[PDB]
Amino acid sequence: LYKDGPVYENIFNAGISSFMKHALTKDGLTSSEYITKTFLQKAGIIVHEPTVVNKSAIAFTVEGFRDTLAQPAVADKFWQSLLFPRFSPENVKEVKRLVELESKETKRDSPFAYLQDILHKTAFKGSPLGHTSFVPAYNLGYIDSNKLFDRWDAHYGFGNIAVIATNIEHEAVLAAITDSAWVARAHNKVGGVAAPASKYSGGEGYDVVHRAKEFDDQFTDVYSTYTAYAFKAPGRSNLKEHAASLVIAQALSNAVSPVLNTSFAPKRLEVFYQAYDTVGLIGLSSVQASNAQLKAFKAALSKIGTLSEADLAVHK
Amino acid sequence: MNHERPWVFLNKVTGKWGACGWQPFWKATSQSLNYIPDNFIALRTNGSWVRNLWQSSKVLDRGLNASGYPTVGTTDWVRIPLDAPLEA
């Protein structure tokens, strides 16, 4: 887990983390992309695409039999990637192509994910949680090797790296990430990065795109409008309130989604609960939404408010 | 070589059973002094299928309701594997 994401960007760096998502996975100083990935893939290890988790960190995840992951070579390759980058211009060009494709595909094939991006962008208007998770068009030309190196220097530090394992005995993990010579060859420094808090607007409010004029209609949906109706909810800071919010979200989701699911049921609704540190969103994203529908959703939430201990047992 | 482990045919309407398996065979010639043939009918096994067949004989001859076993083509024969002893 590497600490970098939209919450750490500004209006001039918007999307730089996305480059960092891929640039670190491309050729480094001490191991190219061909050497690492193939060496991991030929060892029966599934190498996942790096992801941004809570708009605040980049996860590089690897999956395989525990015995294959406990050996100190996989962790060594990850250490090499994170501590000795290269940021070659040709790799940066490849990353530019990849980020363009990611934005375009998410817009075309994941309209609900794009709607979530808009929801956050307008929800937390002048605060770090309102930054964009996709590279804006202009920055596509601006971000290059020098900017990437400056950001890497700013975010450098073993305090910005974490290791998380789920089916490996703890000691073995410690035996794997501590046998690397490259960690011993790296500048020793604990460097933290901090971001401010957030407030919440969102709004009766709008991102305009004529999908029918942008994409071919046969294999994508082009005649629909995506409405996200969201409210402020507690984050993960308080475990009691987080659990209460989980119960509320499950109650709302079960009261809207069909109970009897068929094979080819279409995706028209989603009840989402995005939880962050000390703030969150809970709401309903839908297509062809209506005032009656949104009023019914609000009334359902209010009704959930008045439930008793006995009535809360089912939803719990 | 790797073929199927020995099995037991069982005919339902007639109610008659019998073991079976794949017998390798080759043209006869001189043998080898330093080699006792391994298990060839049931490859990579400690040869327990004989014990399973001996134990299961009483079960099968007594009358077994093998409707939960696969058939062999369109005939009335079903295959019972001899991986583990048959009790039902």
Binding site: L29, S32, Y34, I35, T38, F39, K42, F84, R86, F149, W152, D153, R185, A186, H187, N188, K189 | -
Partner: protein, 228 residues
């Protein structure tokens, strides 16, 4: 050389690899044509000692030297925490692991005491044979004359040119166009503008060598023997 202290502290030689060049084979195979029959075999060879010798980059000693210099850079980076700076030095910086010098860049200020008679001849020849071609009177650098061709291209060379910084690429192109304009009339730059041998820097060979190594990388770690 300007790399001499670094090469000395690592136990290597302070003398250019232009010396120590030697013939090891009788047949120069694969036999290449156009070449008259005997000359195709390569029994007798004609060289002016200014050949590229690119295939000799495939050696363990060169790798050991490169990794020694890289280790010095990484040790400094650990000491001071200026990693990025040190991994972004220009290849014309003597501390760069791929720094390369032309023989004439050090011929006028070499010790020459540890040189055999043949190597002293090589030094004199390098200087005078450089003087014999008059690319310095055309305002060019030797590395400017490494130009790819339309057919049977030198792949590394092309890539080596795209790795250059933009300004240095533009300056190379402008030098070439000025030399072209001069060559129209077979004119030379004013005598005071003659390139000093120590100014004739090998600014493209480090990129050439880095490209060669990177291209051979995937061959030494194949996915499978039959893969492409």
């Amino acid at each position: 050389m300007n790399d001499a202290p670094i090469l000395a502290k690592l136990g290597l030689s302070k003398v250019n690899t232009y010396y120590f060049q030697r013939r090891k084979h009788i047949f120069a195979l694969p036999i290449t044509i156009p070449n008259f029959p005997l000359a195709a075999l390569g029994i007798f060879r004609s060289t002016d000692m200014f050949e590229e010798r690119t295939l000799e980059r495939y050696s363990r000693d060169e790798r050991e030297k490169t990794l020694g210099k890289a280790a010095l850079l990484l040790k400094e980076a650990k000491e001071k925490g200026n990693y990025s700076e040190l991994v972004r030095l220009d290849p014309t910086d003597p501390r760069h692991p791929y720094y390369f010098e032309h023989p004439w860049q050090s011929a006028l200020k070499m010790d020459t005491v540890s040189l055999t008679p043949y190597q002293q001849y090589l030094r004199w020849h390098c200087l005078t044979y450089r003087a014999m071609h008059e690319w310095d009177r055309q305002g060019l650098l030797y590395d400017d004359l490494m130009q790819p061709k339309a057919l049977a291209t030198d792949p590394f060379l092309e890539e080596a040119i795209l790795r250059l910084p933009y300004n240095q690429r533009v300056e190379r192109e402008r030098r070439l166009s000025r030399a072209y304009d001069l060559a129209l009339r077979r004119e030379y730059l004013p005598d005071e503008d003659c390139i000093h041998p120590e100014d004739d820097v090998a600014y493209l060979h480090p990129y050439y060598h880095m490209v060669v190594d990177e291209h051979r990388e995937q061959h030494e770690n194949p996915v499978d023997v039959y893969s492409r």
